[PDB]
Symmetry: C2
Subunit: 455 residues, 2 copies
């Protein structure tokens, strides 16, 4: 069921009715007709103006949109405002790069004249998670809206108000009905949408289980897909790391959004000589956390998104300890109605311990000890994920060399994760395939139409 | 079973045994280790020199490789020689472009420095068809080899000698064992390969059925894929078409490789005023066909690839006629042990006729009649396929404007299909997704690894 249940009080705020089969059919036909309209007639200029208007409205009513996310999945109101700003940046970026990104591409050949057009393909289905209600949508809506692919959205069950308000936001900006439509549907209906001839692609962000189910259904129907899955990013601290700068990013690196970030710095990798120093520094940092009302500007740690999320993180901590891990800090239950989990630090992780290979979507620092840089690289790559990662070193060329050896899609030098409109986002292995954002994400669902005239 | 049965005499020449579970396991491990070796050490220059050597050997022994394709699937020896020459060009092209294509790409950002590397990902599984034994393989092997992705191949059951000899060719070029390995496996074993963690991607060229099976399996395992499926390309003749130039390309457009080409000109779309004239012309061109021994340089029409192929084409022709189509030329059996089908032409096709929407992988010309350019476009787009197509017009500007309105991946002006290393190849709808060749095909299974350094 689609419901808004405030993670801070655990009170049901809204309950939405699921979309009917007839409604779904009407939505797909409307989207398909809109696709044909944009395919036969050039309406790019209008879409550009509309996307800029989406950005204007977000600026103006930022606090309202920020509060909706907080009440939906519990993130700090201040973090929610930051999320809105990034959405404004993404919307404006694609509106500005439109003409450039859609330009035809000349091809070098001495046999004749050749180039390819970048054309739209059809209706795109987007399946998104709750950790960044607006950002997850905008990452794919903005580029596809500009190319001309109408979109249908299946958002997470716990952030229906965010999903619904995004659709209303685009309609308010003046976009034609059908540009994007939220779908309060079940898993079976999602299968029907993917099997619908009017839908030409699927982009999903979420868990491996959901990804495997959606990709399997898409493959059976010959629909292209892009998958953005979990991560268990390695944060590697080399011997020449600047610890003054290190202390400044630690809180953000693992406790931002209460650790519910695919690119969170889940696995800290430190050298023997810095091991004790780091355990003490991370503990000092985690101790500054102040949990409570996410709407209060003083709160610096939000409650997890749901009761189930809290239960899973707590069980993972228990599992780690039961298999030999060492409890460095926290691990103490928080007495409060909200889904709170206190910052916790575990170490003494070994390959025979299950948690060594598991992603923990919570405020849990994990410390891995290595004796050399080569050992650091080995541990970083001994993972089923390959999304992000950080290399901390005062020597830029050194950091760049080590980063290249990490089997992952993204490497952040001397900093936790960052996402910007101009930077491609995506990974490898179980983190998925394909990319979102930049010009790379822009063409995921565009048809490169070759035009060839031989001499 | 994997067997070489000469289409001209229907004589079984070779019978190969299937690879075992252990053999498959040994191959995957070897390929996986080779991937690691190339990822840890720089062996690009050697791979470049080795790819050039593959081209040199193909050049030197062109006739032996050509005859192998002729004996496997029956194409004209002269055509087979042409395929080899294209393979030589594809090989030389990626060897020469290697450095340029692998260069790191700078990303413009005002927040700091950013760029992304083009790194290898792992072992790639290629599934190929018999229509172009060597070209189908080279299209994907050349780019992935340069990238550093070892490859495993599952080729068609009727062209095992081609598959086996291609592996021997790469070995003879000095490439390390495992660079590419042919696999005489079953469909079940193909599923195991896709589910093996050492395999990170799958590129298939073939029928919709095979495509859906492999893509569905890949999706379930979170593996990225590219699909090059069939086509039912429209060959549109506009009002200002140069009929002298038209007559020169017609034979090739539909009878090349006996019509067994995905980008064959299967649907001729002509205006009322030109209808009768085109019927006469196509009939005149088709009458020049000389079927017989494909090794004979006198032959201009080869037998189909198998008895089943022949049976399917003949049934499609019968189906068309039973539903209202008109027989304009041919349609009579050829008495000979070979799998021969004489050039046939049908017209009077209506949307109510099943064949109107079916691809015919044989020497069957189909004529659609329209009254205007708008109708020509509607017919061309009223298809489940969208691979290639042709626009015939003396006014290039006009031809290009019309081509842009066709929903397909490629448009050839005043000529039938053509494939070059520098040109991207692929389509939309049931024709698949993704592109081969060019730079686009080069990055299908590349990990664009982002390196970001904030100010
Ligand atoms: O982070 P996260 O916990 O949100 O990751 P997640 O559990 O994979 O969910 C991400 C998105 O995928 C959806 N989803 C998951 N499994 C699905 C399936 N079998 N079919 C269709 N949609 C499915 C989720 O819907 P729900 O939130 O409704 O599960 C959500 O919208
Ligand atoms: O033209 P065309 O006749 O060559 O198109 P096709 O029948 O689809 O063959 C294309 C390639 O796909 C293979 N293939 C087809 N269905 C398969 C499946 N379910 N699982 C694994 N591989 C499969 C074929 O192997 P086979 O030649 O062995 O059928 C061939 O190598």
């Amino acid at each position: 069921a689609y419901q808004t249940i405030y993670p801070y009080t655990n009170e049901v705020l809204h309950t939405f009715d699921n979309m009917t089969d007839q409604g779904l059919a009407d939505v797909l036909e409307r989207a398909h007709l809109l696709y044909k309209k944009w395919r036969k007639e050039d309406h790019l200029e209008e879409r550009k103006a509309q996307l800029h208007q989406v950005a204007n409205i977000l600026r103006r009513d930022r606090d309202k949109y920020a509060e909706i996310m907080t009440k939906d999945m519990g993130k700090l109101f201040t973090e929610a405002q930051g999320e809105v700003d990034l959405c404004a940046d993404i919307a404006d970026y694609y509106a500005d790069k439109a003409d450039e990104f859609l330009m035809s591409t000349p091809l070098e050949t001495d046999s004749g004249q050749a180039y390819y057009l970048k054309q739209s393909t059809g209706v795109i289905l987007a399946v998104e998670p709750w950790n960044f209600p607006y950002y997850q949508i905008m990452r794919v809506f903005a580029p596809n809206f500009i190319v001309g692919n109408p979109m249908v959205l299946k958002h997470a069950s716990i952030c229906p108000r965010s999903a619904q308000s995004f659709e209303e936001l685009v309609l308010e900006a003046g976009a034609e009905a059908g540009s994007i439509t939220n779908l309060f549907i079940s898993y079976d209906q999602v299968s029907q949408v993917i099997a619908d001839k009017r839908v030409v692609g699927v982009c999903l962000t979420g868990s491996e289980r959901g990804g495997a189910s959606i990709a399997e259904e898409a493959g059976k129907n010959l629909k292209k897909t892009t998958l953005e899955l979990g991560g268990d990013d390695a944060f590697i601290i080399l011997d020449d790391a600047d610890w003054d700068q290190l202390e400044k990013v630690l809180y953000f690196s693992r406790l931002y959004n209460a650790g519910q970030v695919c690119t969170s710095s889940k696995r800290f990798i430190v050298l023997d000589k810095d091991y004790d120093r780091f355990k003490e520094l991370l503990t000092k940092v985690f101790k500054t956390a102040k949990w409570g009302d996410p709407m209060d500007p003083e709160t610096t740690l939000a409650p997890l998104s749901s009761a189930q999320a809290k239960a899973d993180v707590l069980d993972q901590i228990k599992l780690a300890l039961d298999h030999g891990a060492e409890l460095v800090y926290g691990g103490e239950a928080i007495d409060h109605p909200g889904h709170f989990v206190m910052p916790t630090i575990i170490a003494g992780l070994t390959k025979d311990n299950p948690i060594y290979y598991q992603e923990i979507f919570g405020p849990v620092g994990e410390i891995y000890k290595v004796s050399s840089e080569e050992e650091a690289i080995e541990v970083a790559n001994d993972s089923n994920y390959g999304l992000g990662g950080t290399i901390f070193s005062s020597n830029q060329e050194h950091a760049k060399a080590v980063a290249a050896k990490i089997e992952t899609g993204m490497s952040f030098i001397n900093s936790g994760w960052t996402s910007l409109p101009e930077l491609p986002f995506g990974g490898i292995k179980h983190s998925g395939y394909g990319r979102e954002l930049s010009e790379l994400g822009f063409t995921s669902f565009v048809n490169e139409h070759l035009i060839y005239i031989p001499n």
